[PDB]
């Protein structure tokens, strides 16, 4: 049975997502323009990631209990989850019609070629597409999508976490909300093993995060590429 507290948690996270995800993509005009061995898409996609980081921080701040953590722990959690939550939240714009992230317009529709033109390789891009396809196929309720993003952010095993017991206590409240939501509100057959499949997406994200950081380190080690990043991206992903 979904308790009053669990229904409240879901309502907060749905509101938080509403306040931090703009399905009109209006702000994309502000980024450096996309250009389709030159990394022609790096300025645009770095600006897009920088913008997305700001949205993920805004969502995180509204997760019940996140503000009770120390500043150090909030920082560790956001730095370690940012690319994973961006990959998750990007699934909303992903389409299996042509395996692209379609942000409202042809200029802002990104395929595997565009991602390679920001400097990433098939080692990341192939499993990233497989993740987007597998997540899209779960046909998550919006409630499950926002819970999964929150559980991803509040992970007690991230490196450098200090108060791992409090992080785990916050995450457990979200995990039990999600498990009870699936059991009470997701009708079969779509609910079949859904919680385990969602946790599997969190394990897939760790692998994607490790590969992203490897390729980010390689690309940002070249100062000509670092010059095209943003200050926020350099702070979050490293310098």
């Amino acid at each position: 049975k979904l308790s009053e507290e669990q229904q409240h948690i879901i309502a907060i996270l749905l509101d938080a997502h509403h306040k931090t995800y703009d399905p009109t993509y209006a702000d994309f005009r502000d980024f450096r323009p996309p250009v389709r061995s030159p990394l022609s898409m790096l300025p645009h996609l770095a600006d897009l990631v920088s913008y997305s980081i700001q949205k993920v921080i805004g969502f995180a701040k509204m997760i019940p209990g996140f503000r009770d953590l120390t500043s150090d722990d909030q920082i560790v959690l956001l730095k370690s989850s940012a690319i994973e939550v961006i990959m998750l939240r990007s699934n909303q714009s992903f389409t299996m019609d042509d395996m692209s992230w379609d942000c409202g317009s042809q200029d802002y529709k990104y395929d595997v070629t565009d991602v390679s033109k920001a400097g990433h390789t098939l080692e990341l891009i192939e499993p990233l597409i497989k993740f987007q396809v597998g997540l899209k196929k779960l046909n998550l309720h919006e409630e499950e999508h926002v819970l999964l993003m929150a559980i991803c952010i509040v992970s007690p095993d991230r490196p450098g976490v200090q108060d791992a017991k409090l992080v785990e206590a916050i995450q457990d409240r979200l995990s039990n909300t999600l498990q009870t939501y699936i059991r009470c509100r997701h009708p079969p057959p779509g609910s079949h093993q859904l919680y385990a499949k969602m946790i599997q997406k969190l394990a897939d994200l760790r692998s994607l995060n490790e590969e992203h950081s490897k390729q980010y380190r390689s690309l940002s080690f070249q100062p000509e590429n670092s010059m095209k990043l943003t200050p926020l991206v350099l702070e979050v992903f490293g310098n």
Partner: peptide
């Protein structure tokens, strides 16, 4: 380990 932009966005 100075994260002034993150710190500032966190409040």
């Amino acid at each position: 380990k100075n994260h002034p932009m993150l710190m500032n966005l966190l409040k």
